[PDB]
C-alpha cells in the first residue's frame, strides 16, 4: 500500500476505420503544484503499439522500463523479431494486465490507469484498458480519470457503437480527440495546454506527434461577467 506522489492526469483514446488514436498531456503534477511540464506519458512499443499511462509517474517510469526490457527479451534467439514474431498490442496488454493484477494481489499496486492502443498483425484495431486493481475492459472509446467523465461523452457521439467504427475517418477521429483535450484543459485543474498524440494506422503505421498545443480557445465572453449576482460594475 502506498499513495501516488507525482501524477499524470487523463489519457484518452478511440478507434476509427483503419486504426486507433491515443492522446495524453505532458504534465507531472505534485498535488496541486504543476511541477513538471515535459513529461511524455505515451510510450510506443515497436511500430504497432502505444501505451498511454496516467497516475503515479515513478510507477510509470518502472512500467516504461519493463516494456523496454520486453522488446529486448523478445529479440533474444528470435530471427523473426522484426516480422512474424514481433510484439503484438495484445501480447503487451496481457503482460501488463498480468503484472497489474499480481501487484494488487500482493497489496502493493502500481498506482496507474493504462490504455494500450495498437493494430494487430491481421489489421484489427486493439484498444483495451487496465488499472491498479487489475480491472480490464474494452470499448470503441476509452479514457482514464477525468477523461472518462468528459472525453468519453464527446468521443461516443462520433463512435457510439461498433458499427460506427468503419464510418469514422482518421481526420474526424483526430478532430474529436483534439477537441476533447481542449475541453479537459478548460475543466481539469490538473491538466496542461501541452500534449502528445499518437496515431496507429494499419496502412500508414505509427505517427507520433509531440509538442501539440490546445488552440482556438474561447475566453472573450469572460469580459462581460461581473460579480457573483447583484454587482453591475
Amino acid at each position: 500500500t502506498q499513495q501516488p506522489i507525482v501524477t499524470g492526469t487523463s489519457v484518452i483514446s478511440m478507434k476509427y476505420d483503419n486504426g486507433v488514436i491515443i492522446a495524453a498531456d505532458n504534465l507531472g503534477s505534485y498535488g496541486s503544484l504543476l511541477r513538471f511540464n515535459g513529461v511524455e506519458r505515451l510510450i510506443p512499443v515497436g511500430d504497432n503499439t502505444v501505451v498511454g499511462i496516467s497516475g503515479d509517474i515513478s510507477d510509470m517510469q518502472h512500467i516504461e522500463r519493463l516494456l523496454k526490457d520486453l522488446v529486448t527479451e523478445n529479440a533474444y534467439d528470435n530471427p523473426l523479431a522484426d516480422a512474424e514474431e514481433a510484439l503484438e498490442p495484445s501480447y503487451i496488454f496481457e503482460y501488463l494486465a498480468t503484472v497489474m493484477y499480481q501487484r494488487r494481489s500482493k497489496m502493493n499496486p502500481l498506482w496507474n490507469a493504462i490504455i494500450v492502443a495498437g493494430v494487430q498483425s491481421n489489421g484489427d484495431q486493439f484498444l483495451r484498458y487496465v488499472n491498479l486493481l487489475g480491472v480490464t475492459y474494452s470499448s470503441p472509446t476509452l479514457a482514464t480519470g477525468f477523461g472518462a467523465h468528459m472525453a468519453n461523452p464527446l468521443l461516443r457521439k462520433v463512435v457510439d457503437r461498433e458499427s460506427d467504427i468503419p464510418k469514422t475517418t482518421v481526420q474526424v477521429a483526430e478532430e474529436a480527440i483534439v477537441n476533447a483535450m481542449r475541453v479537459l484543459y478548460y475543466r481539469d485543474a490538473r491538466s496542461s495546454r501541452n500534449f502528445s498524440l499518437a496515431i496507429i494506422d494499419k496502412n500508414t503505421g505509427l505517427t507520433f506527434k509531440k509538442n501539440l498545443q490546445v488552440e482556438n480557445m474561447k475566453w472573450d465572453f469572460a469580459k462581460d461577467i461581473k460579480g457573483y449576482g447583484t454587482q453591475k460594475i
Binding site: 467523465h149 468528459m150 468519453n152 464527446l154 475543466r187 465572453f221 447583484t230
Partner: protein
C-alpha cells in the same frame, strides 16, 4: 441528475433530465425537476430532491408576497439573494444545488447556487452528477449570440449527454424557455428517447389465482341518516 442553463439572444433556457434515484434504484422514471419560482423565473434542482423542492416553494411563496407588496414583477436577483441567504444560514445542511434562470424588467438572467450559499454568473451552466458530461457538450458547441432555436438545441444536447453517459441521469428531457417580452414556455417531455419496448409476454393472471381468506366492504361513507 443532469441540469443545464443556456443564455441566448433575447432570453435564457433551462433543461433537465427526468430520472430520480434512491441509491442504484430508479424511484421515478419521469420526475419533474424544472420548478417554478414565479411565472417567468424558473429553476432546476440537483442534490436532495425534497430540499430543492422545499427551498423553491418557500422562496417562491415569499417572492409572490414581495411582488404583491411592491406592485412589481419579481426579479431573478431577488430570488437569488433570498435563496443564498437561506442556504448559507443552514451551512450546507439543506442540500439544494440550483440553476436559477428568468426574465424580468431588468432583462434576462442566469445563475447557479451551491448548497452552502455561494452563487455564480454565467452564459452556460451545468449541475448534478451528469454535469461533466453536459459541460463537455456546452464547452464544445457554445458561442456568443445564440438564437432561441440554437439554445434549445444546445441545452437538450447537453442533457442527452448526461442521459446516455451518467448512470445518475436518464429517461426524458424537460425544457423551459424564458424570452424577454413573452410568456415563459414550459416544455414538459420535450424529448422522449427512452420508451420501453413491448414485453415478450403478457402477465395478466386468470381470475381466482390468488388465495383469499376473508372479504369485506369498507365503509368510506360518513354516518348515515335515519
Amino acid at each position: 441528475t443532469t441540469i443545464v442553463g443556456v443564455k441566448f439572444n433575447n432570453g435564457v433556457v433551462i433543461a433537465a433530465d427526468t430520472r430520480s434515484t434512491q441509491g442504484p434504484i430508479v424511484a421515478d422514471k419521469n420526475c419533474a425537476k424544472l420548478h417554478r419560482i414565479s411565472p417567468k423565473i424558473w429553476c432546476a434542482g440537483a442534490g436532495t430532491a425534497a430540499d430543492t423542492e422545499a427551498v423553491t416553494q418557500l422562496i417562491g411563496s415569499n417572492i409572490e408576497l414581495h411582488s404583491l407588496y411592491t406592485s412589481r414583477e419579481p426579479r431573478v436577483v431577488s430570488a437569488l439573494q433570498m435563496l443564498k441567504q437561506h442556504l448559507f444560514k443552514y451551512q450546507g445542511h439543506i442540500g439544494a444545488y440550483l440553476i436559477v434562470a428568468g426574465v424580468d424588467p431588468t432583462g434576462s438572467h442566469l445563475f447557479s447556487i451551491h448548497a452552502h450559499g455561494s452563487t455564480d454568473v454565467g452564459y452556460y451552466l451545468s449541475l448534478g452528477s451528469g454535469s461533466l458530461a453536459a459541460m463537455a457538450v456546452l464547452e464544445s458547441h457554445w458561442k456568443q449570440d445564440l438564437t432561441k432555436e440554437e439554445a434549445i438545441k444546445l441545452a437538450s444536447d447537453a442533457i442527452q449527454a448526461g442521459i446516455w453517459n451518467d448512470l445518475g441521469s436518464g429517461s426524458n428531457v424537460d425544457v423551459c424557455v424564458m424570452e424577454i417580452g413573452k410568456d415563459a414556455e414550459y416544455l414538459r417531455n420535450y424529448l422522449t428517447p427512452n420508451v420501453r419496448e413491448e414485453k415478450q409476454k403478457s402477465y395478466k393472471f386468470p381470475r381466482g389465482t390468488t388465495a383469499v381468506l376473508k372479504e369485506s366492504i369498507v365503509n368510506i361513507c360518513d354516518i348515515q341518516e335515519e
